[PDB]
A = this chain, B = another copy of it.
Amino acid sequence: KKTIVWFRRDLRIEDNPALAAAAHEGSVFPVFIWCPEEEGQFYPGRASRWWMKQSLAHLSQSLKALGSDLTLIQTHNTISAILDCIRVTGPTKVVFNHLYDPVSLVRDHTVKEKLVERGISVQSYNGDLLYEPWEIYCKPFTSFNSYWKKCLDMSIESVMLPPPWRLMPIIWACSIEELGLENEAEKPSNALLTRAWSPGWSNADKLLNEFIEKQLIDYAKNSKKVVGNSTSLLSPYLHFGEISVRHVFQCARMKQIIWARDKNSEGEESADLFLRGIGLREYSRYICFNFPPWDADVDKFKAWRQGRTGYPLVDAGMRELWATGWMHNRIRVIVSSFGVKFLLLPWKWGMKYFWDTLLDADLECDILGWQYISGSIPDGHELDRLDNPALQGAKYDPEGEYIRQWLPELARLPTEWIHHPWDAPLTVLKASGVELGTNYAKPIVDIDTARELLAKA
């Protein structure tokens, strides 16, 4: 009759089973408990912490519009802090939504154990997945398409809950600044991100609406350019659960149904392709549940993260990542595949840098991504294949516009050579304003010698 609602990475009021459950069985005490030393090695990066702060404030003022507050707590032990919430609130139950990362797994367990030890009941809900990673079983599911063909033959009839109509409310609590989510010196450079992004669940709704109604129809061809923000841009919102992925899946399947009826074959395959992405976020939770000779050269690492490799697609991507906190999925493949296969940087460096600059930085997806670009996951591009920037150029940036947007020094380079300038003839380079080594970098390593120092093993 008096429940605590533990928010973690489900910062929304719509289709939130935990909050819904608690709101219906009675009064609720919503809380967010930050415990850095317990996240340890999985402490969220700089950009992810900045987004978190924004949408925590967004979610908090939403809850007061409904009649409750958001209590924030920063502490050294999570159960310690939880128990005092029970002390001051006299509640009987604690609810939360499952996360699947290693840290929350041990903790959600350790907090279920210690809590029912004292007669207070705990019940967690699935707030982030169409299918929990233990519900779809066997030959193996070592693939993604075996996995995704299985779920699409299993019903997806799980239903979606409205936001609670009202919330009846009920210390070492603190404010949002007091959580320490930003560092003082990085604050103004962080604020610049608001010019590309407005976190919070109400914005998540607005974004999903315009995407489904206007952009989804073109997803299958827009999503192959890397220029512009050609895909949905939902990933940060999905990571913080500011939008229920069930809502995302169902809105998209409504279109697929209508487009299938009305024999609009392009919209059909658009909806097919886009839902595959949603399934990849699923498989990410699936594999991370069931399957728990480096050049340690910091200068090389610095050239990589600053975009001075001489590889335009790479340099552009790193510039976009630094400026916006986001990059198209194929740019993620290109730059990471560049960090390890071309520069032979240790992957912990590259992954740690994605961790600290990606707004959608997400343990399971980011893991699955690095495992793809290194031939680890059985369905990932083998390591010996070192693909040609020119060919990458023709398929994802066929008019050179991505380069010309992020690397304006190269604006007068003809498209035939804008993705591999070291191969153009010299009169072509002088005709463009391009002096390799002076105003754009020389290829930091030549593609051909990197080709065969990689075949070494």
Known: A209-B213, A213-B209. A257 touches B159 (CB 8 A): no
Chain B residue contacts of A61, Cβ below 8 A? 261
When the two chains form their complex, are residues A160 and B157 in contact, meaning their CB atoms are under 8 A apart? no
Chain B residue contacts of A261, Cβ below 8 A? 61-62, 64-65, 202
Chain B residue contacts of A397, Cβ below 8 A? none
**How far apart are the CA atoms of A209 and B211 in the complex, in Å?**
13
Query: Digit string of A193-214 for contact with B (CB within 8 Å is 1, else 0)?
Result: 0000000001001000100010
A246 to chain B, nearest CB (A): 8
Chain B residue contacts of A62, Cβ below 8 A? 257, 261
**How far apart are the CA atoms of A163 and B250 in the complex, in Å?**
9
Total interface residues in chain A, CB < 8 Å: 32
Chain B residue contacts of A156, Cβ below 8 A? 162, 165
A3 to chain B, nearest CB (A): 15
Task: Decide if A14 is an interface residue (CB 8 Å cutoff).
Answer: yes
Chain B residue contacts of A66, Cβ below 8 A? 257
Task: Decide if A174 is an interface residue (CB 8 Å cutoff).
Answer: no
| A66-B257, A209-B213 given; 13 more Cβ-contact pairs under 8 Å | A20-B157, A65-B261, A156-B162, A157-B161, A157-B162, A159-B160, A160-B162, A162-B253, A163-B253, A163-B257, A202-B258, A205-B258, A213-B213
When the two chains form their complex, are residues B257 and A205 in contact, meaning their CB atoms are under 8 A apart? no
Quick one: which of A1-48 are within 8 Å of B by CB?
13-14, 20, 24
Task: Decide if A158 is an interface residue (CB 8 Å cutoff).
Answer: yes
**How far apart are the CA atoms of A209 and B165 in the complex, in Å?**
22
When the two chains form their complex, are residues A155 and B159 in contact, meaning their CB atoms are under 8 A apart? no
Task: Decide if A414 is an interface residue (CB 8 Å cutoff).
Answer: no
Task: Decide if A365 is an interface residue (CB 8 Å cutoff).
Answer: no
Known: A65-B260, A250-B162, A261-B65. A155 touches B213 (CB 8 A): no
Of all chain B residues, the one with the shortest Cβ separation from A259 is B65
Chain B residue contacts of A152, Cβ below 8 A? 165
Task: Decide if A192 is an interface residue (CB 8 Å cutoff).
Answer: no
When the two chains form their complex, are residues A155 and B257 in contact, meaning their CB atoms are under 8 A apart? no
Task: Decide if A133 is an interface residue (CB 8 Å cutoff).
Answer: no
**How far apart are the CA atoms of A162 and B61 in the complex, in Å?**
30
Quick one: which of A158-181 are within 8 Å of B by CB?
158-165
**How far apart are the CA atoms of A261 and B13 in the complex, in Å?**
13
Chain B residue contacts of A13, Cβ below 8 A? 257
When the two chains form their complex, are residues B157 and A254 in contact, meaning their CB atoms are under 8 A apart? no
Main secondary structure of the interface of A (DSSP, over half): helix
Quick one: which of A231-285 are within 8 Å of B by CB?
250, 253-254, 257-258, 260-261
When the two chains form their complex, are residues A205 and B161 in contact, meaning their CB atoms are under 8 A apart? no
**How far apart are the CA atoms of A65 and B202 in the complex, in Å?**
33
Of all chain B residues, the one with the shortest Cβ separation from A163 is B257
**How far apart are the CA atoms of A13 and B258 in the complex, in Å?**
11
Chain B residue contacts of A164, Cβ below 8 A? 157
A164 to chain B, nearest CB (A): 6
When the two chains form their complex, are residues A24 and B250 in contact, meaning their CB atoms are under 8 A apart? no
**How far apart are the CA atoms of A209 and B250 in the complex, in Å?**
15
Kindly identify which residue among B158, B161, B162, B209 contacts A162, using a CB–CB cutoff of 8 Å.
Answer: B158
Quick one: which of A94-123 are within 8 Å of B by CB?
none
When the two chains form their complex, are residues A157 and B65 in contact, meaning their CB atoms are under 8 A apart? no
Chain B residue contacts of A158, Cβ below 8 A? 162
Of all chain B residues, the one with the shortest Cβ separation from A201 is B258
Known: A65-B261, A202-B258, A205-B254. A159 touches B159 (CB 8 A): yes
**How far apart are the CA atoms of A209 and B160 in the complex, in Å?**
18
A-B contact pairs, 6 of them (CB 8 A): A14-B254, A24-B157, A152-B165, A159-B162, A163-B257, A202-B258
Of all chain B residues, the one with the shortest Cβ separation from A263 is B65
**How far apart are the CA atoms of A435 and B66 in the complex, in Å?**
60
**How far apart are the CA atoms of A163 and B254 in the complex, in Å?**
8
Quick one: which of A366-414 are within 8 Å of B by CB?
none
Of all chain B residues, the one with the shortest Cβ separation from A213 is B209
Chain B residue contacts of A155, Cβ below 8 A? 24, 165
Query: Digit string of A143-154 for contact with B (CB within 8 Å is 1, else 0)?
Result: 000000000100
